Amino acid sequence: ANVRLQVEGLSGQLEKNVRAQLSTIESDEVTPDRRFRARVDDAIREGLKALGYYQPTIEFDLRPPPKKGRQVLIAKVTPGVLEHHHHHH
């Protein structure tokens, strides 16, 4: 039940979008494996792909023993280019 994937390398509507995906991820109490990892990347990359990114390299670091939950999975993004920055470089 207690599941909250951590995001890294986002801001504004980017970090918010990935957050939405983070919630839709299979982390709703499943078997995290090479396949789960992909579902996460696709999720972020998908939402990230619609907010200025195309295929941000997003890695992860799973930690079965979270601090305030049941299972935590870290997610760091690193694409390169972004569309419509406006401010905050």
Short mmCIF file of N, CA and C in Angstrom, two decimals:
data_model
loop_
_atom_site.label_atom_id
_atom_site.label_comp_id
_atom_site.label_asym_id
_atom_site.label_seq_id
_atom_site.Cartn_x
_atom_site.Cartn_y
_atom_site.Cartn_z
N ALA A 1 0.84 -1.23 0.00
CA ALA A 1 0.00 0.00 0.00
C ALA A 1 0.86 1.26 0.00
N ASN A 2 1.73 1.37 1.00
CA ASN A 2 2.62 2.53 1.11
C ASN A 2 3.70 2.49 0.04
N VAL A 3 3.47 3.22 -1.05
CA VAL A 3 4.42 3.27 -2.15
C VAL A 3 4.50 4.68 -2.75
N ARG A 4 5.72 5.19 -2.86
CA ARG A 4 5.94 6.52 -3.42
C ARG A 4 7.30 6.60 -4.12
N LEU A 5 7.29 6.48 -5.44
CA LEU A 5 8.53 6.54 -6.21
C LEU A 5 9.13 7.94 -6.16
N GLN A 6 10.44 8.01 -5.92
CA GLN A 6 11.13 9.28 -5.83
C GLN A 6 11.58 9.78 -7.21
N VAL A 7 11.42 11.08 -7.44
CA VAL A 7 11.80 11.69 -8.70
C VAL A 7 13.07 12.51 -8.54
N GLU A 8 13.86 12.60 -9.61
CA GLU A 8 15.11 13.36 -9.57
C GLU A 8 15.47 13.89 -10.95
N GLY A 9 15.63 15.21 -11.04
CA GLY A 9 15.99 15.83 -12.30
C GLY A 9 14.81 16.42 -13.04
N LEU A 10 13.88 16.99 -12.29
CA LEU A 10 12.69 17.61 -12.87
C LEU A 10 12.32 18.88 -12.13
N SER A 11 11.41 19.65 -12.72
CA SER A 11 10.96 20.90 -12.13
C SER A 11 9.68 21.39 -12.81
N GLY A 12 8.97 22.28 -12.13
CA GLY A 12 7.74 22.83 -12.68
C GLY A 12 6.76 21.77 -13.13
N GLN A 13 6.34 21.85 -14.39
CA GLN A 13 5.39 20.90 -14.95
C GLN A 13 6.06 19.57 -15.29
N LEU A 14 7.39 19.54 -15.23
CA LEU A 14 8.12 18.32 -15.52
C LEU A 14 8.05 17.37 -14.34
N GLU A 15 8.47 17.86 -13.18
CA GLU A 15 8.45 17.06 -11.97
C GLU A 15 7.02 16.64 -11.63
N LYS A 16 6.06 17.51 -11.94
CA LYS A 16 4.65 17.22 -11.67
C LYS A 16 4.14 16.12 -12.59
N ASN A 17 4.51 16.18 -13.87
CA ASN A 17 4.09 15.17 -14.83
C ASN A 17 4.60 13.79 -14.41
N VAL A 18 5.91 13.71 -14.18
CA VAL A 18 6.53 12.46 -13.77
C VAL A 18 5.85 11.93 -12.51
N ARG A 19 5.47 12.85 -11.62
CA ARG A 19 4.79 12.48 -10.39
C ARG A 19 3.52 11.70 -10.71
N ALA A 20 2.76 12.21 -11.67
CA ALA A 20 1.53 11.56 -12.09
C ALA A 20 1.83 10.14 -12.54
N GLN A 21 2.86 9.99 -13.36
CA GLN A 21 3.27 8.68 -13.83
C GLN A 21 3.69 7.82 -12.65
N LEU A 22 4.51 8.40 -11.78
CA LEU A 22 4.99 7.71 -10.59
C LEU A 22 3.83 7.04 -9.85
N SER A 23 2.67 7.68 -9.90
CA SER A 23 1.48 7.16 -9.24
C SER A 23 0.85 6.04 -10.06
N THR A 24 0.91 6.17 -11.39
CA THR A 24 0.33 5.16 -12.27
C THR A 24 1.25 3.95 -12.46
N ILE A 25 2.50 4.06 -11.99
CA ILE A 25 3.45 2.95 -12.11
C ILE A 25 2.94 1.70 -11.40
N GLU A 26 3.51 0.55 -11.75
CA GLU A 26 3.12 -0.73 -11.17
C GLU A 26 3.52 -0.84 -9.69
N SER A 27 4.13 0.20 -9.14
CA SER A 27 4.56 0.20 -7.75
C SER A 27 3.39 0.06 -6.76
N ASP A 28 2.20 -0.23 -7.27
CA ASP A 28 1.02 -0.40 -6.43
C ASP A 28 1.02 -1.77 -5.74
N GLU A 29 2.21 -2.26 -5.40
CA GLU A 29 2.37 -3.56 -4.75
C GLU A 29 2.47 -4.68 -5.78
N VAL A 30 3.62 -4.74 -6.45
CA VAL A 30 3.86 -5.75 -7.47
C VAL A 30 5.27 -6.33 -7.35
N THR A 31 5.70 -7.06 -8.38
CA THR A 31 7.03 -7.66 -8.39
C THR A 31 7.99 -6.81 -9.21
N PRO A 32 8.77 -5.93 -8.56
CA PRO A 32 9.72 -5.06 -9.25
C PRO A 32 10.90 -5.82 -9.84
N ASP A 33 11.01 -5.78 -11.16
CA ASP A 33 12.09 -6.45 -11.88
C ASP A 33 12.47 -5.65 -13.12
N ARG A 34 13.41 -6.18 -13.90
CA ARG A 34 13.86 -5.51 -15.12
C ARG A 34 12.66 -5.00 -15.93
N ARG A 35 11.53 -5.69 -15.80
CA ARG A 35 10.32 -5.31 -16.52
C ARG A 35 9.65 -4.12 -15.85
N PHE A 36 9.64 -4.12 -14.52
CA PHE A 36 9.05 -3.03 -13.76
C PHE A 36 9.83 -1.76 -14.04
N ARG A 37 11.15 -1.90 -14.04
CA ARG A 37 12.04 -0.79 -14.30
C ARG A 37 11.68 -0.10 -15.61
N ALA A 38 11.33 -0.90 -16.62
CA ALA A 38 10.96 -0.37 -17.93
C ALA A 38 9.64 0.38 -17.85
N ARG A 39 8.67 -0.19 -17.13
CA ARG A 39 7.37 0.43 -16.97
C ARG A 39 7.51 1.82 -16.36
N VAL A 40 8.48 1.96 -15.46
CA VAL A 40 8.73 3.23 -14.80
C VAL A 40 9.35 4.22 -15.77
N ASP A 41 10.41 3.80 -16.44
CA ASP A 41 11.10 4.65 -17.41
C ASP A 41 10.13 5.14 -18.48
N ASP A 42 9.34 4.22 -19.01
CA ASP A 42 8.36 4.56 -20.04
C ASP A 42 7.38 5.60 -19.51
N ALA A 43 6.92 5.39 -18.29
CA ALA A 43 5.98 6.31 -17.66
C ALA A 43 6.56 7.72 -17.62
N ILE A 44 7.71 7.87 -16.96
CA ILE A 44 8.38 9.16 -16.87
C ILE A 44 8.66 9.72 -18.25
N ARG A 45 9.37 8.93 -19.06
CA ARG A 45 9.73 9.34 -20.41
C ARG A 45 8.50 9.76 -21.21
N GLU A 46 7.39 9.07 -21.00
CA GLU A 46 6.16 9.40 -21.71
C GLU A 46 5.69 10.79 -21.30
N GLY A 47 5.45 10.97 -20.01
CA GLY A 47 5.03 12.27 -19.52
C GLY A 47 6.10 13.31 -19.76
N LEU A 48 7.36 12.88 -19.64
CA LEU A 48 8.51 13.75 -19.86
C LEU A 48 8.63 14.09 -21.34
N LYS A 49 8.24 13.14 -22.18
CA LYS A 49 8.30 13.32 -23.62
C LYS A 49 7.28 14.36 -24.08
N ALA A 50 6.27 14.61 -23.26
CA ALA A 50 5.22 15.56 -23.60
C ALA A 50 5.41 16.93 -22.95
N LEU A 51 6.43 17.08 -22.12
CA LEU A 51 6.67 18.35 -21.44
C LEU A 51 8.00 18.98 -21.82
N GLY A 52 8.56 18.60 -22.96
CA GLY A 52 9.82 19.18 -23.39
C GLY A 52 10.90 18.15 -23.67
N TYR A 53 10.69 16.91 -23.25
CA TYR A 53 11.68 15.87 -23.47
C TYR A 53 11.24 14.91 -24.57
N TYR A 54 12.15 14.03 -24.97
CA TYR A 54 11.87 13.04 -26.00
C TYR A 54 12.13 11.63 -25.48
N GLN A 55 13.28 11.44 -24.85
CA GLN A 55 13.63 10.14 -24.30
C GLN A 55 14.68 10.27 -23.19
N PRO A 56 14.40 11.11 -22.17
CA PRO A 56 15.32 11.31 -21.05
C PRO A 56 15.82 10.01 -20.44
N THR A 57 17.14 9.89 -20.30
CA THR A 57 17.72 8.71 -19.70
C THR A 57 17.37 8.70 -18.22
N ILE A 58 16.41 7.87 -17.84
CA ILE A 58 15.97 7.80 -16.46
C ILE A 58 16.34 6.47 -15.81
N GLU A 59 17.25 6.54 -14.84
CA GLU A 59 17.70 5.36 -14.12
C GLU A 59 16.90 5.20 -12.83
N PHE A 60 17.16 4.13 -12.08
CA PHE A 60 16.42 3.90 -10.84
C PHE A 60 17.25 3.13 -9.82
N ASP A 61 16.87 3.28 -8.55
CA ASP A 61 17.53 2.60 -7.45
C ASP A 61 16.49 2.14 -6.44
N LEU A 62 16.06 0.89 -6.58
CA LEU A 62 15.04 0.33 -5.70
C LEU A 62 15.57 0.08 -4.29
N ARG A 63 14.72 0.35 -3.31
CA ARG A 63 15.06 0.15 -1.91
C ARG A 63 13.86 -0.45 -1.18
N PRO A 64 13.80 -1.79 -1.11
CA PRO A 64 12.71 -2.51 -0.45
C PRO A 64 12.35 -1.97 0.94
N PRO A 65 13.35 -1.49 1.72
CA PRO A 65 13.12 -0.99 3.06
C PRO A 65 13.06 0.53 3.15
N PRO A 66 11.95 1.15 2.71
CA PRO A 66 11.79 2.61 2.77
C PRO A 66 11.82 3.13 4.20
N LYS A 67 11.74 4.44 4.34
CA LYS A 67 11.75 5.07 5.65
C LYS A 67 10.33 5.32 6.16
N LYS A 68 9.43 5.66 5.24
CA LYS A 68 8.05 5.94 5.60
C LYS A 68 7.06 5.19 4.72
N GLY A 69 7.44 4.01 4.27
CA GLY A 69 6.55 3.24 3.42
C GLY A 69 6.83 1.75 3.45
N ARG A 70 6.47 1.07 2.36
CA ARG A 70 6.69 -0.37 2.25
C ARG A 70 7.83 -0.68 1.30
N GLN A 71 7.80 -0.04 0.13
CA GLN A 71 8.83 -0.23 -0.88
C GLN A 71 9.05 1.06 -1.67
N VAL A 72 10.30 1.50 -1.76
CA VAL A 72 10.62 2.72 -2.48
C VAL A 72 11.53 2.46 -3.68
N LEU A 73 11.33 3.25 -4.72
CA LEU A 73 12.12 3.14 -5.94
C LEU A 73 12.52 4.53 -6.44
N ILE A 74 13.83 4.80 -6.45
CA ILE A 74 14.34 6.10 -6.89
C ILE A 74 14.35 6.20 -8.41
N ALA A 75 14.20 7.42 -8.92
CA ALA A 75 14.20 7.65 -10.36
C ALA A 75 14.87 8.97 -10.72
N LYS A 76 16.03 8.88 -11.36
CA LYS A 76 16.77 10.07 -11.78
C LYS A 76 16.72 10.22 -13.29
N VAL A 77 16.30 11.40 -13.76
CA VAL A 77 16.18 11.66 -15.19
C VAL A 77 17.35 12.49 -15.71
N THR A 78 17.72 12.24 -16.97
CA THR A 78 18.81 12.96 -17.61
C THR A 78 18.69 12.89 -19.13
N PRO A 79 17.94 13.82 -19.75
CA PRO A 79 17.74 13.86 -21.19
C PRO A 79 18.80 14.69 -21.90
N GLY A 80 18.66 16.01 -21.83
CA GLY A 80 19.62 16.90 -22.48
C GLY A 80 18.99 18.20 -22.94
N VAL A 81 17.94 18.09 -23.75
CA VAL A 81 17.26 19.28 -24.27
C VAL A 81 15.82 19.36 -23.76
N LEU A 82 15.29 20.58 -23.72
CA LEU A 82 13.92 20.80 -23.27
C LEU A 82 13.23 21.87 -24.12
N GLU A 83 11.93 21.72 -24.30
CA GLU A 83 11.15 22.67 -25.09
C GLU A 83 10.36 23.62 -24.18
N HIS A 84 10.40 24.90 -24.51
CA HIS A 84 9.69 25.91 -23.73
C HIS A 84 10.20 25.94 -22.29
N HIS A 85 11.33 26.59 -22.08
CA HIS A 85 11.92 26.69 -20.75
C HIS A 85 11.38 27.90 -20.00
N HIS A 86 11.27 29.02 -20.70
CA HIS A 86 10.76 30.26 -20.11
C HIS A 86 11.73 30.80 -19.07
N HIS A 87 11.84 30.11 -17.94
CA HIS A 87 12.73 30.53 -16.87
C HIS A 87 13.30 29.33 -16.13
N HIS A 88 14.15 29.59 -15.14
CA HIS A 88 14.77 28.52 -14.36
C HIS A 88 15.60 27.60 -15.25
N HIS A 89 16.88 27.92 -15.38
CA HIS A 89 17.79 27.12 -16.21
C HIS A 89 18.42 26.00 -15.39
#
